[PDB]
């Protein structure tokens, strides 16, 4: 297991790390959220860049990132543009997506970026290499917002992310049944037991999947998302409640 | 689902119900436990008769049952002699097990009795009929303190308990791996979604299995054991922590 240490936080050991998402639509809302989030308790801040409605300007994006960094200098900061293809808020070109991520990487403002596995192998490899050249870690992501793939297909994808150099593979899938939640936990455990080369983040979304956001320590998900106010994906619960449950499971 | 209602407690819907066990050796210790338990919050009181010293005398056992009944007149009361055969604290003959349970049933002092599935069919059938004739519910139980059977085997056992007239089938198994915990959850979910017509209680024991004590509302276990101070089986957690998690899951 190659753990990821970001600003003294060791991802891949101990309790799953709590991630919250900041989703402001404009610079004034981002400023307000950055300030308000300071008093919530969590491990990693994700900026959901696809919720920002001035992504047209690289300057605007980097200024927003700087505002977040200014408010929370000691927090691991994850820059995530979730593509429309994988459930995000707006469609942009592939080159625009890559440019935003490269600018985030070389700005020094963020500790981690999210890169989607199926962006294209050459572009993924180039962007992973660029991140690593500038001491930025890569959360490599895949989503299925319609259904839960087979456990074997989920493992295949997580292993592909490892093969492409991801620091932290990540998969989120949508259960259509309680059985599907067990499939996700099964795939997670299969990584822990047999393909445990780096930390992985997994979740089954929606209400039925909530237990997967709570049981990461048992089956091997290194982080979990909570909501400060609004959820950034279906099934997230209030961040303080999430923390309470994680602590109970950790100490049981 | 047809629920089981005891003293206004509805077992088989809503949040899983919390059972705590009382474990004293004699009348004074049973009184001291019952008094201490006034400060705790739980749904069902189980008397673990196998922890009592003078189990030889039916009179001694009934006197203790009466003390407990009178100490907590409004709580659902479950009478459980766990045989050393199934992880309990001392041995008992099948005939004396029969005598104690029949006496508990016909005394009016208990709302529910635990009856071990593997006691023997004639004795199980007779005792189920005796319980029902006296308006006492049967938690029919099976434990494996060493290992986890296949999901197929566990589901068949729960179905057999239903066929033999259990009001609430119950199985507890010991994981030897994290995979074994998932097997128990899988069996629980199969039972609940395909075969059950009444509440069922399941658990994977030990620290490894703790999630099974928390996730009953999701996968289909109607009750869960917590510890006031001392656990009555491996893996039970503090009863207030148990309740905190159950409420968070219920409201997610
Ligand atoms: O918690 C989730 O399901 C997320 O979709 C939330 C989202 O904001 C993150 O970008 C994603 O990594 C999670 O999988
Ligand atoms: O919580 C458990 O595992 C128990 O063994 C506790 C015990 O006191 C109960 O009689 C039994 O039904 C549980 O399975
Ligand atoms: Cl560049
Ligand atoms: Na991104
Ligand atoms: Na897009
Ligand atoms: Na550069
Ligand atoms: Na005691
Ligand atoms: Na009994
Ligand atoms: Na009688
Ligand atoms: Na009765």
> Mind giving me the DSSP string for A170-214?
EEEE--SSHHHHHHHHHHHHHHHHH--SS--EEEE-TGGGHHHHH
Q: Are A252 and B207 inside 8 Å of each other by CB?
A: yes
Q: Is B53 exposed, middle or buried (0-12, 13-18, 19+ CB in 10 A)?
A: exposed
Q: Is A18 helix (H, G, I), strand (E, B) or coil?
A: strand
Half-sphere exposure of A190 (CA within 13 A, CB side): 16
Which residues, 6 or more positions from A7, have their beta carbon under 8 angstroms from its beta carbon? A74, A75, A76, A111
Q: Which residues are paired to A64 by β-bridges?
A: none
**In chain B, where the domains are located:** 1-252
CA–CA separation, B18 vs B214, rounded Å?
10
CA–CA separation, A174 vs A233, rounded Å?
10
Q: How far is A23 from chain B (nearest CA, A)?
A: 21
Of B186, B235, B245, the CB nearest to A182: B186
Binding site per annotation, positions of A: 21, 46-48, 82, 213, 232, 236
Transcribe A228-239 into DSSP letters.
Answer: SSS-SSTT--BH
The structure tokens 């041995």 sit at B91
Technique of determination: X-ray
CA–CA separation, B137 vs B110, rounded Å?
9
CB B138 within 8 Å of CB B108: no
What resolution, expressed in A, was reported for this entry? Answer: 1.1
Of A178, A179, A248, the CB nearest to B245: A248
User: Ligand 1: which residue has its CA nearest to atom 2?
Assistant: A233
CA A103 / ligand 3 centre spacing (Å): 6
CA B118 / ligand 9 centre spacing (Å): 24
**Can you point out the beta strands (E) in chain B?**
4-6, 9-11, 17-22, 44-48, 77-80, 112-116, 137-144, 168-173, 201-204, 223-225
Residues of A carrying an active site annotation: 143, 170
CB B182 within 8 Å of CB A182: yes
> Which ligand lies nearest to the CA atom of residue B104 in the structure?
8
| Residue A232 structure tokens | 């950034």
User: Which superfamily does A1-252 belong to?
Assistant: Aldolase class I (3.20.20.70)
Q: How far is B34 from chain A (nearest CA, A)?
A: 25
Number of residues written out for chain A: 252
The structure tokens 């109607």 sit at B222
- Using most ligand atoms within 8 A of CB, pick from B76, B169, B232, B235 the residue to mutate for ligand 2: B232
**Can you point out the beta strands (E) in B174-226?**
201-204, 223-225
| Residue B39 structure tokens | 């400060």
Which helix or strand (DSSP H or E) is residue B200 part of?
none
CA–CA separation, B142 vs A139, rounded Å?
45
> Which ligand lies nearest to the CA atom of residue A103 in the structure?
3
Which residues, 6 or more positions from A77, have their beta carbon under 8 angstroms from its beta carbon? A44, A45, A47, A65, A68, A69, A109, A110, A111, A112
Q: From the candidates A204, A211, A221, A227, which should be mutated to test the interface with B, based on the most B CB atoms within 10 A?
A: A211
User: Ligand 1: which residue has its CA nearest to atom 3?
Assistant: A233
B198 is in an annotated binding site: no
């Amino acid at each position: 297991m190659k753990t990821v240490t970001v600003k003294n936080l060791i991802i891949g050991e101990g309790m799953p790390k709590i991630i919250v998402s900041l989703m402001g639509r404009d610079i004034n809302s981002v400023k307000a959220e950055a300030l308000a989030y300071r008093e919530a308790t969590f491990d990693i801040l994700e900026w959901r860049v696809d919720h920002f409605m001035d992504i047209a300007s690289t300057q605007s994006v980097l200024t927003a990132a700087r505002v977040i960094r200014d408010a929370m200098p000691d927090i691991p900061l994850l820059f995530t543009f979730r593509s429309a293809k994988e459930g995000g808020e707006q469609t942009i070109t592939t080159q625009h997506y890559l440019t935003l991520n490269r600018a985030a990487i070389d700005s020094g403002l963020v500790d981690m970026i999210d890169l989607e596995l199926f962006t294209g192998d050459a572009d993924v490899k180039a962007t992973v290499d660029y991140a690593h050249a500038h001491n930025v870690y890569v959360v490599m992501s895949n989503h299925d917002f319609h259904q839960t793939p087979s456990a074997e297909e989920m493992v295949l994808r997580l292993r592909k992310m490892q093969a492409l150099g991801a620091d932290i593979p990540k998969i989120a899938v949508m259960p259509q049944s309680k059985h599907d939640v067990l499939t996700l936990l099964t795939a997670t455990l299969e990584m822990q037991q047999h393909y445990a080369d780096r930390p992985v983040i997994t979740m089954s979304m929606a209400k039925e999947g909530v237990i997967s956001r709570l049981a990461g320590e048992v089956f091997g998900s290194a982080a979990t998302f909570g909501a400060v106010k609004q959820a950034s994906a279906p099934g997230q619960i209030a961040v303080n409640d999430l923390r309470s449950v994680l602590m109970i499971l950790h100490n049981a």
